[PDB]
Amino acid sequence: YAHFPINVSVDGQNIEVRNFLGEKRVRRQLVPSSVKVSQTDPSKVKDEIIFDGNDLEQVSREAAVLHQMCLVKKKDIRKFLDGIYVQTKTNIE
RNA sequence: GUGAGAUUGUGAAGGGAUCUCGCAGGUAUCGUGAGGGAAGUAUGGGGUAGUACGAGAGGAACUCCCAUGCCGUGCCUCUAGUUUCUGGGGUU
Ligand SMILES: [Mg+2]
Structure with a gap:
């Protein structure tokens, strides 16, 4: 994000995800039981x-259902580079 | 088989045969829902916010409320309209 801290809640x-470009809409995704959702503390990694x-x-x-809820609409996406982006794809073991 | 009719072109009482269909449904209520029809559509305000963005000039949006235009289906409590209730009165 550029100006508005995206606040992503995880419970179960x-x-x-709230406060995406300062909007008052809350965006809601129900992840299946096959996938677990975690969140790193901001001590190690920012968000x-x-x-x-x-x-x-x-x-x-699920990582692209999340990417596509938070898309910039009716503004320039070259200037408004905000969103939830996948950077790394790893294993657990 | 059993009931009911008819055989009406030349008089009458008789009674033979034959043909036609009647022989099981009527009445009353609660539902099914194939198929067909088919409808709601727009807007402004509030705040978000003078924030995002931008050198400045300027200048957004969603959730969320509040209303409104056009349309639709009704309704008659109110308000308005209508009176051959010629209702009560007035007046020529
Ligand atoms: Mg239908």
Whole structure:
């Protein structure tokens, strides 16, 4: 983000992202039981949400459901570079 | 088989055969829902916010409330309209 801290809540499988570009809308995703949702503390990494499971295309599916809720609408996306972006794809073991 | 009719072109009482269909439904209520029809559509305000963005000039948006235009289906408590209740009165 550029100006507004994106606040991503994680309780259970549910995930709530608020304050995306200062909007008052809350965006809601119900992650399946096959994928676990974690969150790194801001001591180590600034803001990371962790999607882990066994199916590749259920972990990759949920990380792009999350990417596409937070899309900039009716402004220039070259200037408004805000969102939730996948940077790394790893294993657990 | 059993009931009911008819055989009406030349008089009458008789009674033979034959043909036609009647022989099981009527009445009353609660539902099914195929198929067909098919509808709601727009707007402004509040705050978000003078914030995002921007050198400045300027200048957004969603959740969320509050109303409104056009349309639709009704309704008659109120208000308004209508009076051959010629209702009560007035007046030529
Ligand atoms: Mg239908």
